[PDB]
Design a protein around this motif. Structure first.
Motif, mmCIF file in Angstrom:
data_model
loop_
_atom_site.group_PDB
_atom_site.id
_atom_site.type_symbol
_atom_site.label_atom_id
_atom_site.label_comp_id
_atom_site.label_asym_id
_atom_site.label_seq_id
_atom_site.Cartn_x
_atom_site.Cartn_y
_atom_site.Cartn_z
ATOM 1 N N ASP A 82 3.078 -0.865 43.702
ATOM 2 C CA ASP A 82 3.756 0.212 42.992
ATOM 3 C C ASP A 82 4.626 0.965 43.992
ATOM 4 O OD1 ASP A 82 4.613 2.400 41.618
ATOM 5 O OD2 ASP A 82 2.656 2.896 40.730
ATOM 6 N N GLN A 83 5.938 0.763 43.907
ATOM 7 C CA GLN A 83 6.855 1.302 44.898
ATOM 8 C C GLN A 83 7.169 2.784 44.627
ATOM 9 O OE1 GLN A 83 9.234 -2.886 44.749
ATOM 10 N NE2 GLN A 83 10.287 -1.339 45.961
ATOM 11 N N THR A 84 6.604 3.335 43.556
ATOM 12 C CA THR A 84 6.834 4.724 43.196
ATOM 13 C C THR A 84 5.800 5.690 43.780
ATOM 14 O OG1 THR A 84 5.508 4.959 41.166
ATOM 15 C CG2 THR A 84 7.630 3.776 40.960
ATOM 16 N N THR A 121 11.041 -6.989 36.765
ATOM 17 C CA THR A 121 11.509 -5.832 37.506
ATOM 18 C C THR A 121 10.337 -5.200 38.216
ATOM 19 O OG1 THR A 121 13.227 -5.440 35.851
ATOM 20 C CG2 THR A 121 12.677 -3.616 37.315
ATOM 21 N N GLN A 122 10.467 -5.018 39.530
ATOM 22 C CA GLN A 122 9.396 -4.470 40.342
ATOM 23 C C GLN A 122 8.068 -5.236 40.283
ATOM 24 O OE1 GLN A 122 11.747 -1.544 42.038
ATOM 25 N NE2 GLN A 122 9.536 -1.124 42.192
ATOM 26 N N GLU A 123 8.114 -6.528 39.965
ATOM 27 C CA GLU A 123 6.916 -7.389 40.025
ATOM 28 C C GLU A 123 6.775 -7.980 41.424
ATOM 29 O OE1 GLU A 123 6.838 -10.899 37.542
ATOM 30 O OE2 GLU A 123 4.714 -11.248 37.912
ATOM 31 N N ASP A 124 5.900 -7.368 42.215
ATOM 32 C CA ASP A 124 5.667 -7.804 43.580
ATOM 33 C C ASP A 124 4.208 -7.616 43.866
ATOM 34 O OD1 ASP A 124 8.676 -7.847 44.713
ATOM 35 O OD2 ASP A 124 8.388 -6.142 43.364
ATOM 36 N N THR A 133 -3.563 -2.591 41.045
ATOM 37 C CA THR A 133 -2.311 -1.998 41.495
ATOM 38 C C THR A 133 -2.528 -1.119 42.714
ATOM 39 O OG1 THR A 133 -1.387 -2.039 39.275
ATOM 40 C CG2 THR A 133 -0.394 -0.505 40.851
ATOM 41 N N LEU A 136 9.779 -5.465 51.965
ATOM 42 C CA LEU A 136 10.418 -5.193 50.679
ATOM 43 C C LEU A 136 11.897 -4.911 50.868
ATOM 44 C CD1 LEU A 136 7.819 -3.110 48.800
ATOM 45 C CD2 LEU A 136 8.715 -5.387 48.122
ATOM 46 N N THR A 166 6.942 -12.233 45.392
ATOM 47 C CA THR A 166 7.740 -11.655 44.312
ATOM 48 C C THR A 166 7.546 -12.434 43.005
ATOM 49 O OG1 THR A 166 9.675 -12.987 44.927
ATOM 50 C CG2 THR A 166 9.493 -10.751 45.852
#
Length: 96
Positions: free
Chosen positions: A93-95, A76-79, A5, A19, A72
């Protein structure tokens, strides 16, 4: 397999731009953007035709589409990011 990750903030700025284009459903610069990723080498977990799609992450200045992509998944949020032409992937991890 997934090399690990990775935070979005660590990726090139172009990965953020890709994105956001995925989020808005385009428009995309290249006709290969949003084509199904057939995942031939089983580097990502196996799934039916169309669980994965691929998008260009622009390499500034390059004469080609280069070797950077986001694939993609359906979750959900699987990229996943690749900087080396689908050889290795990191989950994004877009967070962070």
């Amino acid at each position: 397999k997934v090399s690990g990750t990775v935070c979005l903030s660590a990726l090139p700025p172009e990965a953020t731009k890709t994105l956001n284009l995925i989020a808005s459903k385009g428009p995309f610069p290249y006709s290969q953007d949003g084509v199904v990723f057939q995942n031939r080498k089983s580097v990502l977990p196996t799934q039916s035709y169309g669980y994965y799609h691929e998008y260009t992450v622009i390499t500034p200045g390059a004469r080609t589409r280069g070797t950077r992509r986001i694939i993609t998944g359906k979750a959900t949020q699987e990229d996943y990011y690749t900087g080396d032409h689908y050889a290795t992937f990191s989950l994004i991890d877009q967070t962070c």
